[PDB]
């Protein structure tokens, strides 16, 4: 494969990527007339559309490539060769052919330099960002609204991809990523083609930081960015344009310590690294005369040593900023309040269409200790997919809320699927189960892996809801086997939810429920390596609604033990979780008896505690 030959050269020498072609074409000093012969009577002006020059001025583009190759990896002249971008020139219908030609003219140059020079050259298929932003609204007036959709972007990128691959490119390069959701759509397009039609080529992914803040246009940090696109298994990852080498330095060394991939990096004008870069090039301002200076400098430099064990046993999530759950990370609070069924206010504000004030419920939860936000829009009086889509897009607007990862909560996979399309960072999916059999579970788990989300697996199968310690273990053990073995799902992306069910009901059947969850948590944490444990905590205490002090006390008493058994996270009321040591010793001991069913009349004695 090309990956072998690619990784081989990279392990020995730091490769070079060509400068931006736009600078050279600008120097060429075209005129509208010069695009071209073929068109002649085109109703839209083509001047400035560098992409069509592959057809209308091929020799010019070919010579641009040659200069760089002699002065190497060559980008295809395909930065705007999508349906979306070419609509501004009335060439929507021409995307595939433009990429095909752009890849041919580049491939002809590559091989001449390969013949004359002796060393092999590579063609990079450039996929660009388009002007559409899937994570940012066109205006602050309507923050729910979006111009393009995920599926619309996937279609376009898929078509561009076909052309490049057919045109015989050696690397697909998703570059100048202003918005990460676009890049995720591009990655989804590439996975579509590879799944059956094509043999996979290596993917290079380059972000674009705008300021000294270290953030993308879509507000995301480098660390958050790599997590959001790691599922694409890119051979190389980096940054390009917008910033010079000096401004763009400290972000690269952050990115490099967070990934096993090689590190691309091609800055701009208005530089030998310290083990920071694996591939080097230029963008706006870079000429072939620059690349020569870059080439002679990097000639004898020792390439970066990628860490092959970077965040090995961590669950990687991301909002705008990264959020990692390693073995020694403490209990992660996933905020419960943004749930139409489980919250009185939230439901009233969603059903009444007041989404702007509903964001305050998300904002306050994060301020009150919520590290992930659970979003649940399930109600018979709601259009699930749209409301999720709407609320997710609104959250993205508010930077305080958007920082954290999101937990997409629905009993309907189409709602799940809608939220994933609208989320820029890596989310938790909540949930799937074996309720409808193995094949259905696998199809849904196969789709989630494709979007690249973490995932909650409910302790539910064909028999129904798992309420016993053994039944809980059975389902999770079977599930773990299907995910890890049959699908190659990363076991660190698997959360299992043995079901936290109500106790204290006055029905002896429900008495062991808490214990079973804690016991099952132990065996699962020991049985199934990598997987983590979650649970909806407030379900435990439906029996004592009204008495909040008891509910909160129950939660704290429950957690203390659960956490000891191996509970990594939960869907909880983040502000209102007392510390185990500061809970009154009488109430603590009472709840301890209820959770562990040690006292036969534990129910009445708890409700007795009020007074
Ligand atoms: N994977 C998983 N996901 C889940 C659950 C689970 O188990 N497992 N259970 C639910 C977790 N979320 C909540 C949120 C709130 C409450 C709750 O307790 N609400 C109050 C009402 C609060 C209010 O109206 O303000 C009540 O008593 O009904 C319970 C569970 C939904 N998602």
Coordinates of C-alpha atoms and ligand atoms in Angstrom, one line a residue:
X1 CA 0.0 0.0 0.0
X2 CA 0.9 3.7 -0.4
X3 CA 0.8 4.0 3.4
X4 CA 3.8 1.7 3.8
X5 CA 5.9 3.6 1.3
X6 CA 4.6 6.9 2.8
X7 CA 5.4 6.0 6.5
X8 CA 8.7 4.5 5.3
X9 CA 10.1 7.8 3.9
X10 CA 8.7 9.8 6.8
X11 CA 10.4 7.6 9.4
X12 CA 13.7 8.5 7.7
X13 CA 13.3 12.0 6.3
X14 CA 11.0 15.0 6.7
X15 CA 8.9 15.3 3.5
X16 CA 8.0 18.6 1.8
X17 CA 4.6 19.8 0.7
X18 CA 4.4 22.4 -2.1
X19 CA 3.5 26.1 -1.6
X20 CA 0.1 27.7 -2.4
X21 CA -0.6 27.8 -6.1
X22 CA -2.7 30.9 -5.8
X23 CA 0.4 33.1 -5.3
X24 CA 1.9 31.8 -8.6
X25 CA -1.3 32.1 -10.6
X26 CA -1.6 35.7 -9.3
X27 CA 1.9 36.2 -10.6
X28 CA 0.9 34.7 -13.9
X29 CA -1.4 37.7 -14.5
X30 CA -4.1 35.8 -16.4
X31 CA -7.7 38.3 -17.5
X32 CA -11.3 36.9 -17.8
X33 CA -10.6 35.9 -21.4
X34 CA -8.0 33.3 -20.4
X35 CA -10.7 30.9 -19.0
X36 CA -10.8 29.8 -21.7
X37 CA -11.3 28.2 -25.0
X38 CA -13.7 25.5 -24.0
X39 CA -16.2 27.8 -22.3
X40 CA -16.0 31.1 -24.4
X41 CA -19.7 31.9 -24.1
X42 CA -20.2 31.2 -20.3
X43 CA -22.9 33.4 -18.7
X44 CA -20.9 33.8 -15.4
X45 CA -17.5 35.4 -15.0
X46 CA -14.7 32.9 -14.3
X47 CA -11.9 35.3 -13.5
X48 CA -10.5 34.3 -10.1
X49 CA -11.6 30.7 -10.3
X50 CA -8.1 29.2 -10.2
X51 CA -9.7 25.7 -10.2
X52 CA -10.9 25.7 -13.8
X53 CA -7.4 26.5 -15.1
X54 CA -6.7 22.8 -14.9
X55 CA -8.9 22.6 -18.0
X56 CA -8.6 26.1 -19.6
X57 CA -4.9 26.7 -19.0
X58 CA -3.3 23.2 -18.3
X59 CA 0.2 24.0 -19.4
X60 CA 0.3 26.9 -16.9
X61 CA -0.7 24.8 -14.0
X62 CA 1.6 21.9 -15.0
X63 CA 4.6 24.4 -15.1
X64 CA 3.6 25.6 -11.6
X65 CA 3.8 22.0 -10.3
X66 CA 7.2 21.4 -12.0
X67 CA 8.8 24.4 -10.4
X68 CA 7.8 23.1 -6.9
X69 CA 8.8 19.5 -7.7
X70 CA 12.3 20.5 -8.8
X71 CA 12.5 23.0 -5.9
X72 CA 8.2 17.1 -2.5
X73 CA 4.4 16.5 -2.4
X74 CA 2.1 18.2 -4.9
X75 CA -1.4 19.5 -4.0
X76 CA -4.1 19.2 -6.7
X77 CA -5.5 22.5 -7.8
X78 CA -8.8 21.6 -6.2
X79 CA -9.3 23.9 -3.3
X80 CA -12.8 24.9 -4.5
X81 CA -13.6 21.9 -6.7
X82 CA -16.9 21.0 -5.1
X83 CA -20.6 21.4 -6.1
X84 CA -21.0 24.0 -3.3
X85 CA -18.1 26.3 -4.3
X86 CA -18.5 26.1 -8.1
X87 CA -22.1 27.2 -7.9
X88 CA -20.8 30.8 -7.7
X89 CA -19.4 30.2 -11.3
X90 CA -22.2 28.1 -12.7
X91 CA -20.1 25.0 -12.7
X92 CA -21.9 22.9 -10.1
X93 CA -22.3 20.0 -12.6
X94 CA -18.5 20.0 -13.4
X95 CA -17.0 19.1 -10.0
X96 CA -16.0 15.5 -10.8
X97 CA -14.3 16.4 -14.0
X98 CA -12.4 19.3 -12.5
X99 CA -10.8 17.1 -9.9
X100 CA -10.1 14.4 -12.5
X101 CA -8.3 16.9 -14.7
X102 CA -6.7 18.6 -11.7
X103 CA -5.3 15.2 -10.6
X104 CA -4.1 14.3 -14.1
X105 CA -2.1 17.5 -14.7
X106 CA -0.5 17.1 -11.2
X107 CA 0.2 13.4 -11.9
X108 CA 1.9 14.1 -15.2
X109 CA 4.2 16.6 -13.4
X110 CA 5.0 14.2 -10.5
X111 CA 6.2 11.5 -12.9
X112 CA 8.5 13.8 -14.9
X113 CA 10.3 15.0 -11.8
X114 CA 10.3 11.3 -10.7
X115 CA 12.0 10.4 -14.0
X116 CA 14.5 13.3 -14.1
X117 CA 15.2 13.6 -10.3
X118 CA 15.1 9.9 -9.5
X119 CA 13.2 10.3 -6.2
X120 CA 9.5 9.5 -6.3
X121 CA 6.9 12.3 -6.1
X122 CA 3.3 12.2 -4.6
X123 CA 0.0 13.7 -5.6
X124 CA -2.2 15.1 -2.8
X125 CA -5.9 15.4 -3.4
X126 CA -6.9 18.7 -2.0
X127 CA -10.3 18.9 -0.5
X128 CA -11.2 22.5 0.7
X129 CA -13.6 23.9 3.2
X130 CA -16.2 25.7 1.0
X131 CA -17.7 29.0 2.3
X132 CA -20.4 27.1 4.1
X133 CA -20.0 26.7 7.9
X134 CA -22.1 23.8 9.4
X135 CA -21.1 24.8 13.0
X136 CA -21.7 28.6 12.7
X137 CA -24.9 30.4 11.6
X138 CA -24.6 33.1 8.9
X139 CA -25.9 35.7 11.4
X140 CA -26.2 36.2 15.2
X141 CA -29.9 37.1 14.6
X142 CA -30.9 33.5 13.8
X143 CA -28.4 31.3 15.7
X144 CA -30.5 28.2 15.2
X145 CA -30.3 28.5 11.4
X146 CA -27.7 26.9 9.0
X147 CA -26.9 27.3 5.3
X148 CA -25.8 23.8 4.4
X149 CA -26.4 20.3 6.0
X150 CA -24.1 17.4 6.8
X151 CA -25.6 15.2 4.1
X152 CA -25.4 18.0 1.5
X153 CA -21.7 18.4 2.3
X154 CA -21.1 14.7 2.3
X155 CA -22.6 14.4 -1.2
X156 CA -20.4 17.2 -2.6
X157 CA -17.2 15.9 -0.9
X158 CA -18.0 12.4 -2.0
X159 CA -18.1 13.5 -5.7
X160 CA -14.8 15.5 -5.4
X161 CA -13.2 12.5 -3.7
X162 CA -14.3 10.1 -6.5
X163 CA -12.7 12.3 -9.1
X164 CA -9.4 12.7 -7.2
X165 CA -9.1 8.9 -6.5
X166 CA -10.0 8.0 -10.1
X167 CA -7.5 10.7 -11.1
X168 CA -5.0 8.6 -9.1
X169 CA -4.0 10.7 -6.1
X170 CA -1.8 9.1 -3.4
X171 CA -3.1 11.1 -0.4
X172 CA -6.4 12.8 0.3
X173 CA -5.8 16.2 2.0
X174 CA -8.6 17.8 3.8
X175 CA -7.0 21.2 4.3
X176 CA -7.7 24.8 5.6
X177 CA -10.4 23.5 7.9
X178 CA -12.2 26.6 9.2
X179 CA -15.1 24.5 10.5
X180 CA -14.5 21.0 11.8
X181 CA -18.0 19.7 11.1
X182 CA -17.2 20.2 7.4
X183 CA -14.1 18.1 7.9
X184 CA -16.1 15.4 9.6
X185 CA -18.5 15.5 6.6
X186 CA -15.5 15.1 4.3
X187 CA -14.2 12.2 6.5
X188 CA -17.7 10.6 6.3
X189 CA -17.6 11.0 2.5
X190 CA -14.2 9.2 2.4
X191 CA -15.5 6.3 4.6
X192 CA -18.5 5.9 2.3
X193 CA -16.2 5.3 -0.7
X194 CA -13.7 3.0 1.2
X195 CA -16.4 0.8 2.7
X196 CA -17.0 -1.0 -0.6
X197 CA -15.9 0.8 -3.8
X198 CA -12.4 2.0 -3.2
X199 CA -9.1 0.9 -1.6
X200 CA -8.3 3.4 1.1
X201 CA -5.5 6.0 0.6
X202 CA -3.9 7.8 3.5
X203 CA -5.7 11.0 4.8
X204 CA -3.9 14.2 5.7
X205 CA -5.9 16.7 7.8
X206 CA -4.8 20.3 8.3
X207 CA -6.6 22.7 10.6
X208 CA -6.5 26.5 10.5
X209 CA -6.0 28.5 13.7
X210 CA -7.0 32.2 13.3
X211 CA -5.7 34.0 16.4
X212 CA -3.1 33.9 19.2
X213 CA -6.0 32.4 21.2
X214 CA -5.2 29.1 19.5
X215 CA -8.7 28.5 18.2
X216 CA -10.3 27.6 14.8
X217 CA -13.0 29.8 13.2
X218 CA -15.5 27.4 14.6
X219 CA -14.1 28.2 18.1
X220 CA -12.3 24.9 18.6
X221 CA -8.8 24.4 20.1
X222 CA -6.1 22.3 18.4
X223 CA -6.4 19.5 21.0
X224 CA -10.1 19.5 20.6
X225 CA -9.7 19.5 16.8
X226 CA -7.5 16.3 16.7
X227 CA -10.0 14.5 19.0
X228 CA -12.8 15.5 16.7
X229 CA -11.1 14.0 13.6
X230 CA -9.0 11.1 15.1
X231 CA -11.7 8.5 14.0
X232 CA -10.6 9.2 10.4
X233 CA -7.3 7.5 11.3
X234 CA -5.4 10.2 9.5
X235 CA -1.7 9.3 8.7
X236 CA -0.8 12.9 9.2
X237 CA -2.4 15.9 11.0
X238 CA -1.5 19.6 11.2
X239 CA -2.2 23.2 10.6
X240 CA -2.0 25.6 7.6
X241 CA -2.3 29.2 6.4
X242 CA -3.7 32.2 8.5
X243 CA -0.7 32.2 10.8
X244 CA 3.1 32.5 10.2
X245 CA 5.6 30.0 11.5
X246 CA 6.2 32.1 14.7
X247 CA 2.6 32.6 15.7
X248 CA 1.7 29.0 14.7
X249 CA 4.5 27.4 16.6
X250 CA 3.3 26.7 20.2
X251 CA 0.0 25.2 18.9
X252 CA 1.9 22.6 16.7
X253 CA 3.8 21.3 19.7
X254 CA 0.5 21.0 21.6
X255 CA -1.0 19.0 18.7
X256 CA 2.1 16.9 18.4
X257 CA 2.0 15.7 22.0
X258 CA -1.7 14.7 21.6
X259 CA -1.5 12.4 18.5
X260 CA 0.2 9.2 17.3
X261 CA -0.1 10.6 13.7
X262 CA 2.7 12.4 11.9
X263 CA 2.4 16.2 12.0
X264 CA 1.9 18.3 8.9
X265 CA 2.6 22.0 9.1
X266 CA 2.6 24.7 6.3
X267 CA 2.5 28.3 7.6
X268 CA 2.7 31.6 5.7
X269 CA 4.6 34.9 5.3
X270 CA 3.2 38.2 6.4
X271 CA 12.4 27.7 10.0
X272 CA 14.0 24.5 11.4
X273 CA 11.9 23.0 14.2
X274 CA 12.8 21.4 17.5
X275 CA 11.4 17.9 16.8
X276 CA 8.0 19.4 16.1
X277 CA 7.2 18.9 12.3
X278 CA 7.2 15.7 10.1
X279 CA 6.0 17.4 6.9
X280 CA 6.7 21.0 6.0
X281 CA 5.4 23.4 3.3
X282 CA 3.9 26.8 2.6
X283 CA 0.6 28.4 1.9
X284 CA -0.3 32.1 1.1
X285 CA 2.9 33.9 0.2
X286 CA 4.9 30.7 -0.5
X287 CA 6.6 30.5 -3.9
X288 CA 8.8 27.7 -5.4
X289 CA 11.8 29.9 -4.3
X290 CA 10.6 29.5 -0.7
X291 CA 10.2 25.7 -0.9
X292 CA 13.8 25.4 -2.0
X293 CA 14.9 27.2 1.2
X294 CA 12.6 25.0 3.2
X295 CA 14.0 21.9 1.4
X296 CA 17.6 22.7 1.9
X297 CA 17.0 23.5 5.6
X298 CA 15.0 20.3 6.5
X299 CA 17.4 18.2 4.4
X300 CA 19.5 16.8 7.3
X301 CA 17.0 17.3 10.2
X302 CA 15.8 14.3 12.2
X303 CA 12.1 13.7 12.0
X304 CA 9.6 13.9 14.9
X305 CA 9.2 10.7 17.0
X306 CA 5.5 10.1 17.3
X307 CA 4.2 8.9 20.7
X308 CA 2.6 5.5 20.0
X309 CA 1.1 5.5 23.5
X310 CA -0.5 9.0 23.6
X311 CA -3.7 8.9 25.8
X312 CA -3.8 5.1 25.6
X313 CA -6.5 4.2 28.1
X314 CA -8.4 7.4 27.8
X315 CA -11.9 8.2 26.6
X316 CA -11.5 11.1 24.3
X317 CA -14.4 13.5 24.1
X318 CA -14.5 17.1 22.8
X319 CA -16.7 20.1 22.6
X320 CA -14.7 23.2 21.5
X321 CA -12.1 22.1 24.1
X322 CA -10.9 18.5 24.7
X323 CA -12.2 16.5 27.7
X324 CA -10.3 13.3 28.5
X325 CA -11.4 10.5 30.9
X326 CA -8.3 8.6 32.0
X327 CA -8.2 5.8 34.7
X328 CA -7.2 8.3 37.4
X329 CA -9.8 10.9 36.3
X330 CA -12.5 11.3 39.0
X331 CA -16.2 11.0 38.6
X332 CA -17.4 12.8 35.5
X333 CA -20.7 14.7 35.9
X334 CA -23.0 14.6 32.9
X335 CA -25.7 17.2 33.4
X336 CA -29.2 15.9 33.6
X337 CA -31.4 19.0 33.3
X338 CA -31.6 19.5 29.5
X339 CA -34.2 16.7 29.3
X340 CA -37.8 17.3 28.3
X341 CA -39.2 14.3 30.4
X342 CA -36.9 14.7 33.5
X343 CA -37.1 18.5 33.9
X344 CA -40.2 20.7 34.5
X345 CA -38.7 24.1 33.5
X346 CA -36.8 22.8 30.4
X347 CA -39.9 21.1 29.0
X348 CA -42.0 24.3 29.5
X349 CA -39.4 26.4 27.7
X350 CA -38.9 23.9 24.8
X351 CA -42.6 23.3 24.3
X352 CA -43.2 27.0 24.4
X353 CA -40.4 27.4 21.8
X354 CA -38.2 29.5 24.1
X355 CA -34.9 28.1 23.1
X356 CA -32.8 31.2 24.0
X357 CA -33.7 30.9 27.7
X358 CA -33.4 27.1 27.6
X359 CA -29.6 27.7 27.0
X360 CA -29.4 29.2 30.5
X361 CA -30.3 25.7 31.8
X362 CA -27.2 24.4 29.9
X363 CA -25.1 27.4 31.0
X364 CA -25.9 27.1 34.7
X365 CA -25.2 23.4 34.8
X366 CA -21.7 23.9 33.4
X367 CA -21.2 26.7 36.0
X368 CA -22.5 24.3 38.6
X369 CA -20.0 21.5 37.8
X370 CA -21.3 19.8 34.7
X371 CA -18.5 18.5 32.5
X372 CA -20.7 17.0 29.8
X373 CA -24.2 18.0 28.9
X374 CA -27.0 15.5 28.3
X375 CA -29.5 16.7 25.7
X376 CA -32.9 14.9 25.5
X377 CA -35.7 16.1 23.2
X378 CA -38.0 13.1 23.5
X379 CA -41.8 13.9 23.7
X380 CA -44.8 13.0 21.7
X381 CA -45.5 16.7 21.3
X382 CA -42.1 17.3 19.7
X383 CA -40.3 16.8 16.3
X384 CA -37.4 14.9 17.8
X385 CA -34.8 15.3 15.0
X386 CA -35.5 19.0 14.4
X387 CA -35.6 20.1 18.1
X388 CA -32.3 18.2 18.7
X389 CA -30.9 19.7 15.5
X390 CA -32.1 23.2 16.7
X391 CA -30.9 23.0 20.3
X392 CA -27.5 21.5 19.3
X393 CA -26.9 24.3 16.8
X394 CA -27.9 26.9 19.4
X395 CA -25.5 25.4 22.0
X396 CA -22.8 25.8 19.4
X397 CA -23.4 29.5 19.3
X398 CA -22.7 30.0 23.0
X399 CA -19.0 29.5 23.7
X400 CA -19.4 28.9 27.5
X401 CA -21.8 26.0 26.7
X402 CA -20.1 24.7 23.5
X403 CA -16.8 24.1 25.4
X404 CA -18.1 20.8 26.9
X405 CA -18.9 17.6 25.1
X406 CA -22.5 16.7 24.5
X407 CA -24.4 13.5 25.3
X408 CA -27.1 12.9 22.7
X409 CA -29.9 11.2 24.6
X410 CA -32.8 9.5 22.7
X411 CA -34.8 6.3 22.4
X412 CA -34.9 7.1 18.6
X413 CA -31.8 6.5 16.6
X414 CA -32.8 9.1 14.0
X415 CA -32.7 11.7 16.8
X416 CA -29.3 10.4 17.8
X417 CA -28.2 10.5 14.2
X418 CA -29.5 14.1 13.8
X419 CA -27.5 15.3 16.8
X420 CA -24.3 13.7 15.6
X421 CA -24.6 15.6 12.3
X422 CA -25.0 18.9 14.3
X423 CA -22.2 18.4 16.8
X424 CA -18.7 19.5 16.0
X425 CA -16.9 17.8 18.8
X426 CA -16.8 14.1 19.7
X427 CA -20.1 13.3 21.6
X428 CA -21.4 10.5 23.8
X429 CA -24.3 8.6 22.1
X430 CA -27.0 7.6 24.5
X431 CA -28.1 5.0 23.8
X432 CA -28.3 1.7 22.0
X433 CA -29.2 -1.8 23.2
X434 CA -30.0 -5.4 22.1
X435 CA -33.7 -4.8 22.6
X436 CA -34.3 -5.4 18.9
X437 CA -31.7 -8.2 18.4
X438 CA -28.1 -8.4 17.4
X439 CA -28.2 -7.2 13.7
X440 CA -30.0 -4.0 14.6
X441 CA -27.5 -3.3 17.5
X442 CA -24.6 -3.9 15.1
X443 CA -26.1 -1.7 12.4
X444 CA -26.5 1.2 14.9
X445 CA -23.1 0.6 16.5
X446 CA -21.6 0.5 13.0
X447 CA -23.1 3.9 12.2
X448 CA -21.9 5.5 15.4
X449 CA -18.4 4.2 14.9
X450 CA -18.6 5.9 11.4
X451 CA -19.6 9.3 13.0
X452 CA -16.8 8.5 15.5
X453 CA -18.7 9.0 18.8
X454 CA -18.4 7.5 22.2
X455 CA -21.4 5.3 23.0
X456 CA -23.6 4.2 25.8
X457 CA -24.7 0.5 25.7
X458 CA -27.9 -0.1 27.8
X459 CA -28.3 -3.3 29.8
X460 CA -31.4 -4.2 27.7
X461 CA -31.8 -7.3 25.5
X462 CA -34.5 -9.5 23.9
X463 CA -35.6 -10.6 27.3
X464 CA -36.2 -7.0 28.4
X465 CA -34.6 -4.7 31.0
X466 CA -31.7 -6.2 33.0
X467 CA -32.7 -5.8 36.7
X468 CA -30.5 -8.6 38.2
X469 CA -26.7 -8.6 38.7
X470 CA -26.2 -11.6 36.4
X471 CA -28.6 -10.3 33.6
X472 CA -26.8 -7.0 33.7
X473 CA -23.4 -8.7 33.2
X474 CA -24.7 -11.0 30.5
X475 CA -25.9 -8.2 28.2
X476 CA -22.8 -6.1 28.7
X477 CA -20.5 -9.1 28.2
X478 CA -22.3 -10.1 25.0
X479 CA -22.3 -6.5 23.8
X480 CA -18.6 -6.0 24.5
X481 CA -17.9 -9.1 22.4
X482 CA -19.9 -7.9 19.4
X483 CA -18.4 -4.3 19.6
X484 CA -14.8 -5.2 20.2
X485 CA -14.5 -8.5 18.3
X486 CA -17.0 -8.2 15.4
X487 CA -16.7 -4.5 14.8
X488 CA -13.2 -3.5 16.2
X489 CA -14.9 -0.8 18.3
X490 CA -12.4 0.9 20.6
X491 CA -13.2 -0.4 24.0
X492 CA -12.4 3.0 25.5
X493 CA -15.4 4.4 23.5
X494 CA -17.7 1.9 25.2
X495 CA -19.8 3.0 28.2
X496 CA -22.1 0.4 29.7
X497 CA -25.2 1.3 31.6
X498 CA -26.4 -1.4 33.9
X499 CA -29.8 0.2 34.7
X500 CA -30.1 2.3 37.8
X501 CA -33.7 1.7 38.8
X502 CA -35.9 3.1 41.5
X503 CA -35.7 1.6 45.0
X504 CA -37.8 2.3 48.2
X505 CA -41.0 1.7 46.3
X506 CA -42.6 -0.6 48.9
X507 CA -42.2 -3.7 46.6
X508 CA -39.7 -6.4 47.8
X509 CA -38.7 -7.2 44.1
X510 CA -37.0 -3.8 43.8
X511 CA -34.9 -4.1 47.0
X512 CA -31.7 -5.5 45.4
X513 CA -31.7 -3.2 42.4
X514 CA -29.1 -0.7 43.8
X515 CA -26.8 -3.5 45.0
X516 CA -27.1 -5.4 41.6
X517 CA -25.9 -2.2 39.8
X518 CA -22.9 -1.9 42.1
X519 CA -22.1 -5.6 42.0
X520 CA -22.5 -5.6 38.2
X521 CA -20.2 -2.6 38.0
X522 CA -17.4 -4.5 39.7
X523 CA -17.6 -7.6 37.5
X524 CA -17.8 -5.5 34.3
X525 CA -14.8 -3.3 35.3
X526 CA -12.9 -6.5 35.9
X527 CA -14.3 -8.6 33.0
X528 CA -14.3 -6.1 30.1
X529 CA -11.1 -4.2 29.7
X530 CA -11.4 -0.6 28.4
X531 CA -15.2 -0.1 28.8
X532 CA -16.5 2.3 31.4
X533 CA -19.6 2.5 33.5
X534 CA -22.4 5.2 33.6
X535 CA -25.9 5.5 35.0
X536 CA -28.8 7.9 35.4
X537 CA -28.4 8.6 39.1
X538 CA -31.7 10.5 39.9
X539 CA -33.7 7.4 38.8
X540 CA -32.7 5.8 42.1
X541 CA -34.7 8.3 44.2
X542 CA -38.1 8.7 42.4
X543 CA -39.6 7.0 45.5
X544 CA -38.8 10.1 47.7
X545 CA -39.8 13.0 45.4
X546 CA -40.4 16.2 47.3
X547 CA -37.8 15.3 50.0
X548 CA -34.9 16.6 48.0
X549 CA -32.4 16.5 50.9
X550 CA -33.0 12.7 51.1
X551 CA -32.7 12.4 47.3
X552 CA -29.4 14.2 47.3
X553 CA -28.2 12.2 50.3
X554 CA -29.2 8.9 48.6
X555 CA -27.2 10.0 45.5
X556 CA -24.1 10.8 47.6
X557 CA -24.4 7.5 49.6
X558 CA -25.0 5.6 46.4
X559 CA -22.1 7.2 44.5
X560 CA -19.5 6.7 47.2
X561 CA -19.8 2.9 46.9
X562 CA -20.5 2.9 43.1
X563 CA -17.4 5.0 42.5
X564 CA -15.4 2.5 44.6
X565 CA -16.7 -0.4 42.5
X566 CA -15.7 1.4 39.3
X567 CA -18.4 3.9 38.2
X568 CA -16.6 6.3 36.0
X569 CA -19.4 8.8 35.3
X570 CA -23.1 9.4 35.5
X571 CA -26.1 11.5 34.5
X572 CA -26.5 13.6 37.6
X573 CA -27.7 16.9 39.0
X574 CA -24.3 18.5 39.0
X575 CA -24.8 21.2 41.6
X576 CA -26.6 19.0 44.0
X577 CA -24.3 16.1 45.0
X578 CA -23.2 16.3 48.6
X579 CA -19.7 15.1 49.8
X580 CA -19.9 11.7 51.4
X581 CA -18.0 12.8 54.5
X582 CA -20.1 15.9 55.1
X583 CA -23.5 14.0 55.0
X584 CA -25.2 13.7 58.5
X585 CA -24.2 10.4 60.1
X586 CA -27.8 9.3 60.9
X587 CA -29.1 10.0 57.4
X588 CA -26.0 8.5 55.8
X589 CA -26.3 5.3 57.8
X590 CA -30.1 5.1 57.0
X591 CA -29.5 5.4 53.2
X592 CA -26.6 3.0 53.5
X593 CA -29.1 0.5 54.8
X594 CA -31.7 1.1 52.0
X595 CA -29.1 0.8 49.2
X596 CA -27.7 -2.4 50.7
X597 CA -31.1 -3.8 51.8
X598 CA -29.5 -4.7 55.2
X599 CA -32.5 -3.5 57.2
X600 CA -35.8 -5.3 56.1
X601 CA -37.8 -2.2 57.0
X602 CA -35.4 0.2 55.4
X603 CA -38.1 2.0 53.4
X604 CA -40.3 3.2 56.3
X605 CA -37.3 4.2 58.4
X606 CA -36.1 6.5 55.6
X607 CA -39.5 8.1 55.0
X608 CA -39.7 8.3 58.8
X609 CA -36.5 10.5 58.8
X610 CA -38.8 13.4 58.0
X611 CA -40.1 15.2 60.1
Ligands
LIG1 N1 -28.3 5.9 30.0 C1 -29.3 6.4 30.7 N2 -29.9 7.5 30.3 C2 -30.9 8.1 31.0 C3 -31.4 7.5 32.2 C4 -30.7 6.2 32.6 O1 -31.0 5.6 33.7 N3 -29.7 5.8 31.8 N4 -32.4 8.1 32.9 C5 -32.7 9.4 32.6 C6 -31.6 10.3 33.3 N5 -32.0 11.7 33.5 C7 -32.8 12.0 34.5 C8 -33.1 13.4 34.7 C9 -33.9 13.8 35.7 C10 -34.5 12.9 36.6 C11 -35.4 13.4 37.8 O2 -35.3 12.8 38.8 N6 -36.2 14.4 37.5 C12 -37.2 14.8 38.6 C13 -37.9 16.1 38.1 C14 -37.0 17.3 38.3 C15 -37.7 18.6 37.8 O3 -38.9 18.5 37.4 O4 -37.1 19.7 37.9 C16 -38.2 13.7 38.8 O5 -38.2 13.3 40.0 O6 -38.9 13.3 37.9 C17 -34.2 11.6 36.5 C18 -33.4 11.1 35.5 C19 -32.7 9.8 31.1 N7 -31.5 9.2 30.5

